[PDB]
Design a protein around this ligand. Structure first.
Ligand code: CA
Lengths: 231, 224
């Protein structure tokens, strides 16, 4: 029982509240780091999924200015379909499937372009800017919090008693930090849901792509069944 | 020497040249079909596995590595947020797409590529060789007959009969070859049909998988 007010302030800034605020800031900087590494690797695996072919992939990241494997298959079928002639059914059949392959090629183009713009680019920005700036901030605030905490303890050690006016200042600053962490927490809650939204952009793009592959393939399927039946 | 002249006009005339052309046409069709199958088989393989380092068998599917990456980070984030579990949901969706892709590669390989390779290495190669053979034999007899005619003017009725018999054999052999190629022609169209069917089943299964994940994320975003 001595230096009462000083001990209460020391009890908070360096007690429970203090440690909790420090973990909160640490907790958030962890989630940001994970999100950052995640977004980066998922971005890379997505591109590789869109264009497993390295030559065409390098061009994708440029943005399409490259040919789709489907288009190359289409060309092969159409070229030889022509050389075979219409004196048979395989010749014209290669032209019907070759056309479909070229059609698949175009929807594949749209899939690459849409994922590139509505999923890859956004994550690249999220990673290079937003997450990078938030991370530095968390660390910067985490350092200050630790600094003022030490200065306070060291001061209490020297003077024993810290004036009432300086105590409240220390309390105001600690409080300002509690607000900053809370403001970051909510900001992160919003980012968290926006990230799920970006994932939708990816999934929605694939669905549309495949939906169109189906329409294209169901059709050419009819053309072939009929061709065989009518040989 | 009417008799001798009638045979000569057949074997060394229009009908002879028609048969000869019929053989050369099928030969042509075989060469083209042979080269076409090789090229189409190759582009199909490159379409199934665009990444060259992984065309050997035809490594893990690109879809599978993506699913891996999402699940790993999906769990490193935790179940407190929404992104972590979301990645888990979409991750599983990617793995299921990897399963379906696997099937595509397997079914296209089995019902399109191998049949084509077989056709190119066996069937087309045998027919091609047989066509060369009958073609040379056909010309060989046409010449032999022509020089026999020059050598003796009038050719014995029995030798005329043999000449006509051999010519008929080849004429029928060509008729057989024509039909054999007709069989193959429609067979090849069936192979393309098998290719399309496999792709169609793949994309259909992909649609269903994606429709599911779509609803799950739709809901998750709503309850956020
Ligand atoms: Ca006959």
């Amino acid at each position: 029982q001595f230096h009462k007010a000083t001990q209460k302030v020391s009890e908070k800034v360096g007690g429970a509240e203090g440690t909790k605020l420090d973990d909160d800031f640490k907790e958030m900087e962890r989630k940001v780091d994970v999100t950052s590494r995640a977004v980066m690797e998922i971005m890379t695996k997505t591109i590789e999924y869109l264009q497993p072919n390295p030559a065409s992939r390098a061009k994708l990241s440029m943005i399409p200015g490259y040919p789709q494997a489907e288009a190359l298959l289409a060309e092969a079928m159409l070229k030889f379909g022509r050389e075979l002639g219409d004196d048979c059914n395989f010749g014209p059949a290669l032209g019907e499937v070759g056309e479909a392959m070229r059609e698949l090629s175009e929807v594949k183009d749209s899939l690459d372009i849409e994922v590139k713009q509505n999923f890859i680019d956004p994550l690249q920005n999220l990673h290079d800017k937003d997450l990078r700036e938030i991370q530095s901030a968390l660390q910067h605030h985490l350092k200050k919090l630790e600094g003022r905490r030490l200065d306070f303890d060291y001061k209490k050690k020297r003077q024993g008693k810290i004036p009432d006016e300086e105590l409240r200042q220390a309390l105001e600053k600690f409080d300002e930090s509690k607000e900053i962490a809370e403001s970051s927490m909510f900001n992160l809650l919003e980012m968290d849901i926006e990230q799920v939204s970006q994932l939708s952009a990816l999934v929605q793009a694939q669905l549309e792509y495949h939906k169109q592959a189906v329409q294209i393939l169901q059709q050419v399927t009819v053309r072939l069944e009929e061709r065989i039946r009518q040989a």
